[PDB]
Design a binder for this molecule. Sequence first.
Ligand code: ACP
Ligand code: MG
Length: 405
Amino acid sequence: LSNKLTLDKLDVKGKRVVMRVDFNVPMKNNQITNNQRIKAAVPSIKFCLDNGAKSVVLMSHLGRPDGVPMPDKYSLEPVAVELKSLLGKDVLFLKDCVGPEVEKACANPAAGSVILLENLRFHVEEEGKGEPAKIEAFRASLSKLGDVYVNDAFGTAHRAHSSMVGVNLPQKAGGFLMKKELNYFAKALESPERPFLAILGGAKVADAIQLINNMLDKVNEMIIGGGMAFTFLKVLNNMEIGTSLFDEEGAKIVKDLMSKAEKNGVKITLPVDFVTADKFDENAKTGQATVASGIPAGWMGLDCGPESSKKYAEAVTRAKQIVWNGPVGVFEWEAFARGTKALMDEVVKATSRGCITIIGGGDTATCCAKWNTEDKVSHVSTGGGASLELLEGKVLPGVDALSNI
Ligand SMILES: Nc1ncnc2c1ncn2[C@@H]1O[C@H](COP(=O)(O)OP(=O)(O)CP(=O)(O)O)[C@@H](O)[C@H]1O
Ligand SMILES: [Mg+2]
């Protein structure tokens, strides 16, 4: 951000500040399981209030509602409540993010007002798919809600979405979390300790498989776990994967990615065994499978097994630096948590002997919180996919859209 406006040089006294934040917090049942991403934005928010901001309007997405209002499932209202105790100040929740009624609530608020808007992805124009003149109008509406713009949404900085790249105000500044996270990665990615291991898991398989190509020019080893592994095993091993996550598009480039890993001397560690489930449910009936046995029809692999855990542990022992994005099983549910807990144990042990260990992702960061290892690894990032795009060597669209100095 050496070429960009940042919040420390933004005059906010008497100004209304509209601020993109990443409040896409994990939720189990109906409540927040991890407030990390909300806590992480507090320094920028308090800064604005302490330095005389008239208001701070906060906007974020939550989940992937795909352009339809889904306030039953994906409302930011609970975040408003959280943000109150974290700040020491009340926050006013609006049930939308645009136009006339929100614009009114934001036009001229009482001094010191903190306002949280509803999920931006309730509108198709944020993403906007899931409409050119409406997109421009959506952007115009958001722009009216402050006099100056701050983007502190590091977690979403890889997304060229309307709230991230489309706000038209004269001053667009990166916030302190954006700065912290970018500075940490610039130092850690400048001359990584080697072997440099990427650990890839999670459930955003379509997105994550498309990052592998360029990551293979940066790392010396890769674990491909969690939900992503099934696409590779089906293609490479002709493994039966039952109802496990599968990415039909990524499947078409699996053999090319393996060839490039071979060409670049990147050792790829795929799981070899699984905990299976008869349905996607915490209380599913469970089984065991190997790559050779395959997974029976109608069942899904929701964790790796012990033999995979040993292979992952071997890769970790070799590593001098690690970036881990995506749990290696459905760790929120105890029947499917063992693989991720075991890998966590190994990643903590590596740290203790000098490995540089970087954990990224809203959900993988929740692993740290669950097993109390947030201060037992080198860095827990608010970015997941965002951090991996930095590892690929890209400029993030949400940073690119900021004002130049
Ligand atoms: N085999 C599997 N099948 C289905 N889901 C799985 C899975 N293994 C892991 N998951 C799910 O992956 C989810 C997290 O994936 P995700 O891609 O969101 O990781 P993350 O949050 O660390 C990266 P990001 O910040 O980009 O969202 C968890 O909810 C976990 O239950
Ligand atoms: Mg996630």
